[PDB]
Protein backbone atom coordinates (compact mmCIF):
# COMPACT_ATOMS: atom_id res chain seq x y z
CA UNK A 1 0.00 0.00 0.00
CA UNK A 2 0.96 3.68 0.04
CA UNK A 3 1.24 3.88 3.83
CA UNK A 4 2.29 1.50 6.60
CA UNK A 5 -0.32 0.85 9.28
CA UNK A 6 0.77 -0.75 12.57
CA UNK A 7 -2.04 -2.63 14.36
CA UNK A 8 -1.76 -2.21 18.14
CA UNK A 9 -3.82 -3.00 21.24
CA UNK A 10 -2.98 -0.96 24.35
CA UNK A 11 -6.29 -1.23 26.24
CA UNK A 12 -9.66 -3.01 26.21
CA UNK A 13 -12.74 -1.00 25.27
CA UNK A 14 -16.29 -1.94 24.32
CA UNK A 15 -16.63 1.24 22.31
CA UNK A 16 -14.21 4.05 21.48
CA UNK A 17 -15.10 7.48 22.84
CA UNK A 18 -13.10 10.30 21.22
CA UNK A 19 -10.96 11.58 24.09
CA UNK A 20 -7.29 12.46 23.75
CA UNK A 21 -6.86 14.35 27.05
CA UNK A 22 -3.58 13.02 28.50
CA UNK A 23 -4.55 13.99 32.08
CA UNK A 24 -7.74 11.91 32.09
CA UNK A 25 -6.37 8.39 32.42
CA UNK A 26 -9.73 6.97 33.47
CA UNK A 27 -11.59 8.05 30.31
CA UNK A 28 -9.07 8.78 27.56
CA UNK A 29 -7.78 6.69 24.65
CA UNK A 30 -4.55 4.84 25.41
CA UNK A 31 -2.56 6.20 22.49
CA UNK A 32 -2.52 9.75 23.84
CA UNK A 33 0.55 9.75 26.07
CA UNK A 34 3.84 9.23 24.19
CA UNK A 35 2.35 9.06 20.68
CA UNK A 36 0.52 12.41 20.77
CA UNK A 37 2.26 14.01 23.77
CA UNK A 38 5.92 13.08 23.78
CA UNK A 39 7.76 13.24 27.11
CA UNK A 40 10.74 15.41 28.01
CA UNK A 41 12.77 12.30 28.79
CA UNK A 42 12.19 8.54 28.57
CA UNK A 43 13.92 6.55 31.31
CA UNK A 44 14.85 3.10 30.07
CA UNK A 45 13.85 1.13 33.13
CA UNK A 46 15.19 -2.23 31.92
CA UNK A 47 18.60 -0.62 31.42
CA UNK A 48 19.22 0.99 34.79
CA UNK A 49 16.87 3.94 34.23
CA UNK A 50 19.16 5.32 31.53
CA UNK A 51 17.71 8.67 30.45
CA UNK A 52 16.89 8.98 26.76
CA UNK A 53 16.46 12.63 25.95
CA UNK A 54 13.47 13.58 23.83
CA UNK A 55 11.87 17.06 24.04
CA UNK A 56 14.42 18.00 26.71
CA UNK A 57 18.11 17.76 25.82
CA UNK A 58 19.40 17.90 29.41
CA UNK A 59 18.51 18.22 33.08
CA UNK A 60 20.59 19.14 36.12
CA UNK A 61 19.77 18.76 39.81
CA UNK A 62 21.12 21.06 42.52
CA UNK A 63 23.66 19.78 45.04
CA UNK A 64 21.09 19.89 47.85
CA UNK A 65 18.62 17.97 45.65
CA UNK A 66 16.03 20.68 46.31
CA UNK A 67 15.67 21.87 42.71
CA UNK A 68 16.25 20.84 39.10
CA UNK A 69 16.55 22.63 35.73
CA UNK A 70 15.52 21.09 32.39
CA UNK A 71 16.93 22.28 29.06
CA UNK A 72 14.38 22.23 26.23
CA UNK A 73 15.40 21.09 22.76
CA UNK A 74 15.36 23.93 20.25
CA UNK A 75 13.65 23.62 16.88
CA UNK A 76 10.80 21.34 17.98
CA UNK A 77 7.33 22.12 16.59
CA UNK A 78 3.83 21.26 17.71
CA UNK A 79 1.81 19.48 15.02
CA UNK A 80 0.12 22.79 14.08
CA UNK A 81 3.51 24.36 13.39
CA UNK A 82 3.88 26.45 16.55
CA UNK A 83 7.10 26.19 18.59
CA UNK A 84 7.57 23.85 21.57
CA UNK A 85 9.08 25.99 24.37
CA UNK A 86 9.46 26.37 28.15
CA UNK A 87 6.08 28.15 28.12
CA UNK A 88 4.30 24.84 27.49
CA UNK A 89 6.13 23.00 30.26
CA UNK A 90 5.47 25.73 32.82
CA UNK A 91 1.79 25.88 31.85
CA UNK A 92 1.35 22.13 32.09
CA UNK A 93 2.80 21.93 35.60
CA UNK A 94 0.93 24.98 36.80
CA UNK A 95 -2.25 23.39 35.42
CA UNK A 96 -1.75 20.18 37.38
CA UNK A 97 -0.96 22.15 40.56
CA UNK A 98 -4.09 24.29 40.16
CA UNK A 99 -6.27 21.30 39.30
CA UNK A 100 -4.99 18.38 41.39
CA UNK A 101 -7.61 15.99 39.98
CA UNK A 102 -5.25 15.97 36.96
CA UNK A 103 -2.37 14.70 39.12
CA UNK A 104 -2.21 10.96 38.48
CA UNK A 105 1.20 10.31 40.08
CA UNK A 106 1.55 12.52 43.15
CA UNK A 107 3.77 15.08 41.45
CA UNK A 108 2.12 17.93 43.36
CA UNK A 109 3.53 16.73 46.68
CA UNK A 110 7.07 16.98 45.26
CA UNK A 111 7.04 20.11 43.09
CA UNK A 112 6.14 23.34 44.88
CA UNK A 113 6.60 25.54 41.83
CA UNK A 114 8.01 25.99 38.35
CA UNK A 115 9.77 28.92 36.73
CA UNK A 116 10.63 29.89 33.18
CA UNK A 117 14.35 30.70 33.13
CA UNK A 118 14.20 31.51 29.43
CA UNK A 119 12.38 30.24 26.33
CA UNK A 120 14.26 26.94 26.53
CA UNK A 121 14.94 26.37 30.23
CA UNK A 122 12.64 25.47 33.13
CA UNK A 123 13.50 25.33 36.83
CA UNK A 124 11.56 23.14 39.27
CA UNK A 125 11.57 23.80 43.00
CA UNK A 126 10.99 20.89 45.37
CA UNK A 127 9.21 20.41 48.70
CA UNK A 128 11.80 17.88 49.91
CA UNK A 129 15.13 16.46 48.72
CA UNK A 130 14.50 13.87 45.99
CA UNK A 131 17.14 12.58 43.59
CA UNK A 132 14.35 10.70 41.76
CA UNK A 133 12.38 13.83 40.87
CA UNK A 134 13.49 14.01 37.20
CA UNK A 135 11.84 10.60 36.79
CA UNK A 136 8.67 11.96 38.43
CA UNK A 137 8.69 15.11 36.30
CA UNK A 138 8.89 13.07 33.10
CA UNK A 139 5.51 11.48 33.95
CA UNK A 140 3.61 14.77 33.47
CA UNK A 141 2.10 15.36 30.02
CA UNK A 142 3.21 18.59 28.36
CA UNK A 143 0.44 20.17 26.32
CA UNK A 144 0.43 23.24 24.01
CA UNK A 145 -0.22 26.38 26.07
CA UNK A 146 -1.55 28.30 23.06
CA UNK A 147 -4.39 25.81 22.72
CA UNK A 148 -5.11 24.70 26.28
CA UNK A 149 -5.03 28.14 27.91
CA UNK A 150 -8.06 28.96 25.74
CA UNK A 151 -9.91 25.89 26.98
CA UNK A 152 -12.54 26.63 29.61
CA UNK A 153 -12.04 23.58 31.82
CA UNK A 154 -9.10 21.28 30.97
CA UNK A 155 -10.41 18.71 33.48
CA UNK A 156 -13.47 18.10 31.28
CA UNK A 157 -11.83 18.87 27.91
CA UNK A 158 -11.99 15.83 25.61
CA UNK A 159 -9.38 17.18 23.15
CA UNK A 160 -10.98 15.56 20.09
CA UNK A 161 -8.73 17.34 17.57
CA UNK A 162 -5.38 17.15 19.32
CA UNK A 163 -2.34 19.34 18.77
CA UNK A 164 0.67 17.30 19.77
CA UNK A 165 4.43 16.95 19.91
CA UNK A 166 4.68 13.21 19.33
CA UNK A 167 4.96 11.05 16.22
CA UNK A 168 1.24 10.37 15.62
CA UNK A 169 -1.14 13.30 16.01
CA UNK A 170 -3.47 13.10 13.01
CA UNK A 171 -6.84 11.41 13.54
CA UNK A 172 -7.28 9.83 10.07
CA UNK A 173 -10.20 7.49 10.77
CA UNK A 174 -12.49 7.35 13.81
CA UNK A 175 -15.38 4.96 14.45
CA UNK A 176 -16.65 3.30 17.66
CA UNK A 177 -14.74 0.15 16.73
CA UNK A 178 -11.64 1.40 14.90
CA UNK A 179 -9.46 4.48 14.79
CA UNK A 180 -6.29 5.31 12.89
CA UNK A 181 -3.72 7.80 14.17
CA UNK A 182 -1.33 9.09 11.52
CA UNK A 183 2.03 10.86 11.41
CA UNK A 184 2.53 14.34 12.82
CA UNK A 185 3.38 16.39 9.68
CA UNK A 186 5.80 18.53 11.74
CA UNK A 187 7.35 15.77 13.83
CA UNK A 188 10.80 16.77 15.15
CA UNK A 189 12.18 13.23 14.89
CA UNK A 190 10.64 12.37 11.53
CA UNK A 191 13.90 11.06 10.02
CA UNK A 192 13.91 8.35 12.72
CA UNK A 193 10.30 7.26 12.11
CA UNK A 194 9.37 4.68 9.45
CA UNK A 195 5.84 3.79 10.55
CA UNK A 196 3.13 5.99 9.00
CA UNK A 197 0.23 5.32 11.33
CA UNK A 198 -1.19 3.44 14.29
CA UNK A 199 -4.26 1.29 13.66
CA UNK A 200 -6.30 0.67 16.83
CA UNK A 201 -9.17 -1.90 16.79
CA UNK A 202 -11.75 -2.19 19.57
CA UNK A 203 -11.32 -5.41 21.59
CA UNK A 204 -13.30 -5.95 24.80
CA UNK A 205 -11.67 -8.93 26.49
CA UNK A 206 -9.11 -11.74 26.28
CA UNK A 207 -11.48 -14.09 24.46
CA UNK A 208 -12.03 -11.62 21.62
CA UNK A 209 -8.31 -10.94 21.59
CA UNK A 210 -7.35 -14.61 21.29
CA UNK A 211 -9.23 -15.15 18.03
CA UNK A 212 -7.67 -12.09 16.43
CA UNK A 213 -4.08 -12.69 17.47
CA UNK A 214 -4.09 -16.38 16.48
CA UNK A 215 -5.42 -15.39 13.02
CA UNK A 216 -2.49 -13.03 12.53
CA UNK A 217 -4.59 -9.85 12.61
CA UNK A 218 -2.38 -7.98 15.08
CA UNK A 219 1.13 -6.52 14.99
CA UNK A 220 1.99 -5.28 18.50
CA UNK A 221 0.14 -6.51 21.57
CA UNK A 222 0.65 -7.16 25.28
CA UNK A 223 -2.35 -9.24 26.28
CA UNK A 224 -2.65 -12.48 28.19
CA UNK A 225 -2.70 -15.42 25.77
CA UNK A 226 -3.49 -18.89 27.17
CA UNK A 227 -1.37 -21.88 26.05
CA UNK A 228 0.57 -19.45 23.88
CA UNK A 229 2.91 -22.01 22.28
CA UNK A 230 0.05 -24.21 21.08
CA UNK A 231 -2.49 -21.51 20.19
CA UNK A 232 -0.56 -18.52 18.88
CA UNK A 233 3.06 -19.49 18.25
CA UNK A 234 2.12 -22.65 16.36
CA UNK A 235 -0.23 -20.88 13.94
CA UNK A 236 2.49 -19.13 11.94
CA UNK A 237 6.27 -18.78 11.65
CA UNK A 238 5.67 -15.01 11.90
CA UNK A 239 4.12 -15.23 15.38
CA UNK A 240 6.60 -14.30 18.10
CA UNK A 241 6.66 -13.25 21.75
CA UNK A 242 9.06 -12.15 24.48
CA UNK A 243 8.03 -12.05 28.16
CA UNK A 244 10.62 -10.31 30.33
CA UNK A 245 9.90 -10.31 34.08
CA UNK A 246 7.52 -7.76 35.62
CA UNK A 247 6.05 -6.81 38.98
CA UNK A 248 4.25 -8.14 42.00
CA UNK A 249 0.69 -9.44 41.97
CA UNK A 250 -1.30 -9.73 45.17
CA UNK A 251 -4.60 -10.00 46.94
CA UNK A 252 -5.30 -6.62 48.50
CA UNK A 253 -7.71 -6.47 51.44
CA UNK A 254 -9.80 -3.44 52.38
CA UNK A 255 -8.90 -2.28 55.92
CA UNK A 256 -11.92 0.08 55.92
CA UNK A 257 -14.64 -2.33 54.79
CA UNK A 258 -18.02 -1.03 55.97
CA UNK A 259 -19.39 -4.48 56.92
CA UNK A 260 -18.74 -5.27 60.59
CA UNK A 261 -18.04 -8.98 60.13
CA UNK A 262 -15.82 -8.54 57.09
CA UNK A 263 -13.95 -5.66 58.76
CA UNK A 264 -13.37 -7.86 61.80
CA UNK A 265 -11.78 -10.54 59.62
CA UNK A 266 -9.77 -8.42 57.19
CA UNK A 267 -8.17 -6.17 59.81
CA UNK A 268 -6.94 -9.21 61.76
CA UNK A 269 -3.29 -10.08 60.98
CA UNK A 270 -3.81 -13.74 61.97
CA UNK A 271 -6.61 -13.91 59.42
CA UNK A 272 -4.52 -12.30 56.68
CA UNK A 273 -1.70 -14.75 57.38
CA UNK A 274 -4.09 -17.72 57.31
CA UNK A 275 -5.58 -16.52 54.00
CA UNK A 276 -2.02 -16.31 52.67
CA UNK A 277 -1.05 -19.83 53.81
CA UNK A 278 -4.17 -21.29 52.20
CA UNK A 279 -2.92 -20.28 48.77
CA UNK A 280 -0.95 -22.58 46.49
CA UNK A 281 1.00 -19.96 44.52
CA UNK A 282 2.83 -22.40 42.23
CA UNK A 283 -0.46 -24.01 41.22
CA UNK A 284 -1.87 -20.55 40.45
CA UNK A 285 1.14 -19.89 38.21
CA UNK A 286 0.88 -23.32 36.56
CA UNK A 287 -2.85 -23.21 35.85
CA UNK A 288 -3.94 -19.58 35.52
CA UNK A 289 -0.74 -18.35 33.85
CA UNK A 290 0.46 -21.52 32.09
CA UNK A 291 3.75 -21.27 33.99
CA UNK A 292 4.38 -17.60 33.19
CA UNK A 293 5.38 -16.24 36.57
CA UNK A 294 7.47 -16.78 39.70
CA UNK A 295 6.33 -17.47 43.28
CA UNK A 296 6.37 -14.43 45.52
CA UNK A 297 6.65 -15.60 49.12
CA UNK A 298 7.80 -12.24 50.49
CA UNK A 299 5.34 -10.89 53.07
CA UNK A 300 6.59 -7.43 51.99
CA UNK A 301 5.80 -8.22 48.36
CA UNK A 302 9.40 -7.46 47.29
CA UNK A 303 9.76 -10.59 45.14
CA UNK A 304 12.89 -12.46 44.06
CA UNK A 305 14.05 -9.92 41.43
CA UNK A 306 15.48 -7.66 44.13
CA UNK A 307 17.99 -9.95 45.86
CA UNK A 308 20.55 -7.19 46.40
CA UNK A 309 17.87 -5.25 48.31
CA UNK A 310 16.27 -7.93 50.43
CA UNK A 311 16.87 -8.32 54.14
CA UNK A 312 17.09 -12.12 54.16
CA UNK A 313 16.37 -12.29 57.90
CA UNK A 314 13.01 -10.52 57.42
CA UNK A 315 12.13 -12.57 54.35
CA UNK A 316 12.90 -15.81 56.18
CA UNK A 317 11.01 -14.75 59.31
CA UNK A 318 7.68 -14.30 57.54
CA UNK A 319 8.10 -16.65 54.56
CA UNK A 320 6.18 -19.41 56.35
CA UNK A 321 3.07 -17.22 56.33
CA UNK A 322 3.44 -16.85 52.56
CA UNK A 323 3.93 -20.50 51.69
CA UNK A 324 1.32 -23.16 50.96
CA UNK A 325 0.35 -24.71 54.29
CA UNK A 326 -3.31 -25.62 54.53
CA UNK A 327 -2.99 -27.39 57.87
CA UNK A 328 -1.05 -24.40 59.19
CA UNK A 329 -3.83 -22.08 58.02
CA UNK A 330 -6.50 -24.14 59.79
CA UNK A 331 -4.43 -24.20 62.98
CA UNK A 332 -3.86 -20.44 62.88
CA UNK A 333 -7.57 -19.74 62.33
CA UNK A 334 -8.28 -21.92 65.38
CA UNK A 335 -5.64 -20.24 67.56
CA UNK A 336 -6.92 -16.81 66.53
CA UNK A 337 -10.53 -17.66 67.36
CA UNK A 338 -12.14 -17.88 63.92
CA UNK A 339 -14.37 -20.77 64.86
CA UNK A 340 -17.26 -22.25 62.89
CA UNK A 341 -20.27 -21.90 65.20
CA UNK A 342 -23.13 -22.61 62.77
CA UNK A 343 -22.10 -25.99 61.33
CA UNK A 344 -21.54 -25.01 57.69
CA UNK A 345 -17.82 -25.74 57.59
CA UNK A 346 -16.81 -22.09 57.26
CA UNK A 347 -15.13 -20.14 60.04
CA UNK A 348 -16.98 -17.26 61.64
CA UNK A 349 -15.51 -14.16 63.27
CA UNK A 350 -14.48 -14.04 66.93
CA UNK A 351 -17.76 -12.16 67.63
CA UNK A 352 -19.65 -15.10 66.11
CA UNK A 353 -20.59 -13.59 62.76
CA UNK A 354 -20.71 -15.47 59.47
CA UNK A 355 -19.21 -13.84 56.41
CA UNK A 356 -18.26 -14.45 52.81
CA UNK A 357 -15.46 -12.51 51.16
CA UNK A 358 -16.20 -11.12 47.73
CA UNK A 359 -12.99 -11.21 45.70
CA UNK A 360 -12.85 -9.03 42.57
CA UNK A 361 -10.68 -8.93 39.46
CA UNK A 362 -11.35 -7.03 36.21
CA UNK A 363 -13.78 -8.26 33.57
CA UNK A 364 -11.96 -9.85 30.66
CA UNK A 365 -8.60 -10.19 32.45
CA UNK A 366 -9.00 -13.93 32.34
CA UNK A 367 -5.65 -14.85 33.88
CA UNK A 368 -6.60 -12.82 36.95
CA UNK A 369 -10.19 -14.17 36.92
CA UNK A 370 -8.88 -17.73 36.96
CA UNK A 371 -6.44 -16.85 39.74
CA UNK A 372 -9.33 -15.62 41.89
CA UNK A 373 -11.39 -18.74 41.22
CA UNK A 374 -8.46 -21.00 42.19
CA UNK A 375 -8.00 -18.94 45.37
CA UNK A 376 -11.72 -19.26 46.22
CA UNK A 377 -11.36 -23.04 46.05
CA UNK A 378 -8.13 -23.06 48.06
CA UNK A 379 -9.69 -20.83 50.73
CA UNK A 380 -12.67 -23.18 51.05
CA UNK A 381 -10.27 -26.03 51.90
CA UNK A 382 -9.25 -24.18 55.08
CA UNK A 383 -12.78 -23.03 55.91
CA UNK A 384 -12.67 -19.46 54.59
CA UNK A 385 -15.83 -18.63 52.62
CA UNK A 386 -15.28 -16.54 49.51
CA UNK A 387 -16.64 -16.09 46.03
CA UNK A 388 -15.56 -14.33 42.88
CA UNK A 389 -16.76 -11.26 41.03
CA UNK A 390 -15.40 -10.01 37.71
CA UNK A 391 -16.66 -6.40 37.40
CA UNK A 392 -15.82 -4.09 34.49
CA UNK A 393 -12.46 -2.43 35.09
CA UNK A 394 -14.04 0.96 35.83
CA UNK A 395 -16.38 -0.62 38.41
CA UNK A 396 -13.48 -2.68 39.84
CA UNK A 397 -11.35 0.43 40.06
CA UNK A 398 -14.04 2.67 41.53
CA UNK A 399 -14.82 0.08 44.24
CA UNK A 400 -11.20 0.34 45.38
CA UNK A 401 -11.06 4.16 45.24
CA UNK A 402 -14.28 4.35 47.31
CA UNK A 403 -13.42 1.52 49.71
CA UNK A 404 -16.52 -0.57 49.02
CA UNK A 405 -14.73 -3.78 48.01
CA UNK A 406 -13.67 -6.70 50.23
CA UNK A 407 -10.63 -8.25 48.52
CA UNK A 408 -9.15 -7.41 45.11
CA UNK A 409 -6.55 -9.23 43.02
CA UNK A 410 -4.20 -6.79 41.36
CA UNK A 411 -0.86 -6.27 39.69
CA UNK A 412 1.45 -3.34 40.30
CA UNK A 413 3.92 -1.05 38.61
CA UNK A 414 7.44 -2.49 38.51
CA UNK A 415 10.66 -0.50 38.45
CA UNK A 416 14.44 -0.76 38.54
CA UNK A 417 14.43 -0.61 42.33
CA UNK A 418 11.87 -1.57 45.01
CA UNK A 419 10.51 1.95 45.45
CA UNK A 420 8.24 1.81 42.41
CA UNK A 421 6.27 -1.06 43.97
CA UNK A 422 6.52 -0.08 47.65
CA UNK A 423 5.69 3.59 47.17
CA UNK A 424 2.78 3.07 44.80
CA UNK A 425 1.43 0.16 46.85
CA UNK A 426 1.81 1.59 50.37
CA UNK A 427 2.27 5.37 50.52
CA UNK A 428 -0.86 6.58 52.31
CA UNK A 429 -0.72 9.93 50.48
CA UNK A 430 -1.73 7.99 47.35
CA UNK A 431 -4.98 6.86 49.03
CA UNK A 432 -6.54 10.28 48.36
CA UNK A 433 -6.95 12.44 45.26
CA UNK A 434 -9.28 12.18 42.27
CA UNK A 435 -6.43 11.30 39.91
CA UNK A 436 -5.14 8.40 42.01
CA UNK A 437 -4.99 4.80 40.78
CA UNK A 438 -6.08 1.76 42.77
CA UNK A 439 -2.77 0.48 44.05
CA UNK A 440 -2.60 1.92 47.55
CA UNK A 441 -6.35 1.57 48.24
CA UNK A 442 -6.18 -0.94 51.12
CA UNK A 443 -6.33 2.08 53.46
CA UNK A 444 -3.72 0.68 55.81
CA UNK A 445 -1.81 3.65 57.20
CA UNK A 446 1.54 3.73 58.97
CA UNK A 447 3.33 7.01 59.73
CA UNK A 448 6.75 5.43 60.11
CA UNK A 449 6.34 3.67 56.77
CA UNK A 450 5.37 6.86 54.91
CA UNK A 451 8.40 8.57 56.47
CA UNK A 452 10.76 5.87 55.23
CA UNK A 453 9.24 5.95 51.73
CA UNK A 454 9.53 9.74 51.59
CA UNK A 455 13.22 9.50 52.59
CA UNK A 456 14.18 6.87 50.00
CA UNK A 457 15.90 9.34 47.67
CA UNK A 458 16.62 12.04 50.26
CA UNK A 459 20.24 11.29 50.99
CA UNK A 460 22.89 10.53 48.43
CA UNK A 461 24.03 7.67 50.65
CA UNK A 462 23.75 4.17 49.16
CA UNK A 463 24.09 2.33 52.48
CA UNK A 464 21.48 4.54 54.14
CA UNK A 465 19.07 3.96 51.25
CA UNK A 466 19.56 0.20 51.68
CA UNK A 467 18.81 0.49 55.41
CA UNK A 468 15.66 2.47 54.57
CA UNK A 469 14.60 -0.38 52.26
CA UNK A 470 15.19 -2.92 55.06
CA UNK A 471 13.01 -0.79 57.34
CA UNK A 472 10.18 -0.66 54.82
CA UNK A 473 10.46 -4.40 54.27
CA UNK A 474 10.18 -5.15 57.98
CA UNK A 475 7.11 -2.99 58.53
CA UNK A 476 5.10 -4.39 55.66
CA UNK A 477 6.12 -8.00 56.31
CA UNK A 478 5.30 -8.04 60.01
CA UNK A 479 1.85 -6.55 59.37
CA UNK A 480 1.12 -8.78 56.32
CA UNK A 481 -0.54 -5.77 54.74
CA UNK A 482 -1.39 -7.54 51.50
CA UNK A 483 -1.14 -11.15 50.36
CA UNK A 484 1.53 -11.29 47.64
CA UNK A 485 1.13 -14.18 45.22
CA UNK A 486 3.62 -13.99 42.37
CA UNK A 487 5.90 -11.92 40.20
CA UNK A 488 4.49 -11.69 36.69
CA UNK A 489 5.60 -11.00 33.15
CA UNK A 490 5.58 -8.17 30.64
CA UNK A 491 3.39 -10.01 28.10
CA UNK A 492 4.31 -9.01 24.58
CA UNK A 493 3.50 -10.53 21.22
CA UNK A 494 4.79 -9.33 17.89
CA UNK A 495 4.18 -10.29 14.29
CA UNK A 496 6.92 -10.18 11.65
CA UNK A 497 4.52 -10.35 8.70
CA UNK A 498 4.32 -6.60 8.10
CA UNK A 499 7.14 -5.07 10.20
CA UNK A 500 10.66 -5.80 11.42
CA UNK A 501 12.92 -4.13 13.98
CA UNK A 502 11.15 -5.53 17.02
CA UNK A 503 12.67 -5.69 20.46
CA UNK A 504 13.02 -9.27 21.69
CA UNK A 505 15.27 -11.60 23.67
CA UNK A 506 18.08 -11.22 21.11
CA UNK A 507 17.44 -7.47 20.87
CA UNK A 508 16.38 -6.59 24.42
CA UNK A 509 16.48 -2.81 24.11
CA UNK A 510 13.83 -2.08 26.73
CA UNK A 511 10.37 -2.93 28.01
CA UNK A 512 8.59 -4.02 24.82
CA UNK A 513 4.95 -3.46 25.75
CA UNK A 514 2.31 -1.37 24.10
CA UNK A 515 0.36 -0.36 27.23
CA UNK A 516 -0.05 3.28 28.15
CA UNK A 517 2.35 3.99 31.00
CA UNK A 518 5.24 2.26 29.22
CA UNK A 519 6.98 5.34 27.82
CA UNK A 520 9.57 3.14 26.09
CA UNK A 521 6.84 2.30 23.56
CA UNK A 522 7.83 5.58 21.90
CA UNK A 523 11.41 4.34 21.50
CA UNK A 524 10.18 0.98 20.29
CA UNK A 525 8.00 2.33 17.50
CA UNK A 526 10.99 4.42 16.27
CA UNK A 527 12.81 1.13 15.58
CA UNK A 528 10.10 -0.52 13.47
CA UNK A 529 10.32 -0.79 9.68
CA UNK A 530 7.67 -1.99 7.21
CA UNK A 531 8.18 -5.21 5.21
CA UNK A 532 7.34 -5.30 1.50
CA UNK A 533 4.36 -7.67 1.20
CA UNK A 534 4.46 -10.92 -0.75
CA UNK A 535 2.71 -10.46 -4.09
CA UNK A 536 -0.75 -11.92 -4.64
CA UNK A 537 -4.05 -11.44 -6.46
C1 LIG B 1 -0.07 -2.47 36.46
C2 LIG B 1 -1.28 -2.45 35.55
O1 LIG B 1 -2.37 -2.02 35.90
N1 LIG B 1 -1.06 -2.91 34.31
C3 LIG B 1 -2.13 -2.99 33.33
C4 LIG B 1 -2.04 -4.25 32.48
O2 LIG B 1 -2.12 -5.38 33.36
C5 LIG B 1 -3.21 -4.26 31.49
O3 LIG B 1 -3.06 -5.32 30.57
C6 LIG B 1 -3.98 -6.39 30.77
O4 LIG B 1 -3.41 -7.25 31.75
C7 LIG B 1 -4.29 -8.33 32.11
C8 LIG B 1 -3.70 -9.06 33.32
O5 LIG B 1 -2.52 -9.83 33.02
C9 LIG B 1 -4.46 -9.23 30.89
O6 LIG B 1 -5.42 -10.26 31.14
C10 LIG B 1 -4.95 -8.42 29.70
O7 LIG B 1 -4.91 -9.22 28.53
C11 LIG B 1 -4.12 -7.15 29.47
N2 LIG B 1 -4.79 -6.31 28.49
C12 LIG B 1 -4.17 -5.78 27.42
C13 LIG B 1 -5.06 -5.00 26.51
O8 LIG B 1 -2.98 -5.94 27.19
C14 LIG B 1 -3.21 -2.96 30.68
C15 LIG B 1 -4.40 -2.91 29.75
O9 LIG B 1 -5.62 -2.99 30.50
O10 LIG B 1 -3.27 -1.84 31.55
C16 LIG B 1 -2.09 -1.80 32.36
O11 LIG B 1 -2.10 -0.57 33.06
CA1 LIG C 1 14.47 4.61 13.47
CA1 LIG D 1 -19.82 -20.88 59.95
CL1 LIG E 1 1.53 29.16 33.29
CL1 LIG F 1 9.63 -9.90 53.14
MG1 LIG G 1 -2.88 30.87 34.31
MG1 LIG H 1 3.94 28.91 22.66
MG1 LIG I 1 10.44 9.31 8.39
MG1 LIG J 1 20.13 3.02 60.13
Author numbering: -1 to 535
Paper text:
VhCBP is a periplasmic chitooligosaccharide-binding protein mainly responsible for translocation of the chitooligosaccharide (GlcNAc)2 across the double membranes of marine bacteria. The chitooligosaccharide-specific SBP is localized to the periplasmic compartment of the bacterial cell wall and serves as a mobile component of the (GlcNAc)2-specific ABC transporter. SBPs share a common structural feature comprising two domains connected by a flexible hinge region. VcCBP and VhCBP belong to cluster C/subcluster IV (C-IV), members of which are specific for oligosaccharides, including mannooligosaccharides, cellooligosaccharides, and chitooligosaccharides.
(GlcNAc)4 partially occupied the closed sugar-binding groove, with two reducing-end GlcNAc units extending beyond the sugar-binding groove and barely characterized by weak electron density. The electron density of (GlcNAc)4 on the reducing-end side was too weak to place the two GlcNAc moieties at the imaginary affinity sites 3 and 4. This suggests that the mobility of the fourth sugar has a knock-on effect to weaken the binding of the third sugar. Flipping of the Phe411 side chain was also observed in the complex with (GlcNAc)4, as in the complex with (GlcNAc)3, and appears to widen the space at sites 3 and 4. It is most likely that GlcNAc residues are present at sites 3 and 4 and are disordered because of the large space on these two sites. Docking simulation of the structure of VhCBP in complex with (GlcNAc)4 revealed that interactions are formed mostly with the two GlcNAc units at the affinity sites 1 and 2, whereas on sites 3 and 4, only two hydrogen bonds are formed, by the main-chain carbonyl of Ala514 and the Oδ side chain of Gln102, respectively. The middle glycosidic linkage of the bound (GlcNAc)4 was also twisted, as in (GlcNAc)3 bound to VhCBP. The disadvantage derived from the twist of the glycosidic linkage appears to predominate over the advantages derived from additional interactions/disorder of the GlcNAc residues at sites 3 and 4, resulting in the lower affinity for (GlcNAc)4. The binding affinity did not correspond to the degree of polymerization and was the lowest in the longest ligand, (GlcNAc)4.
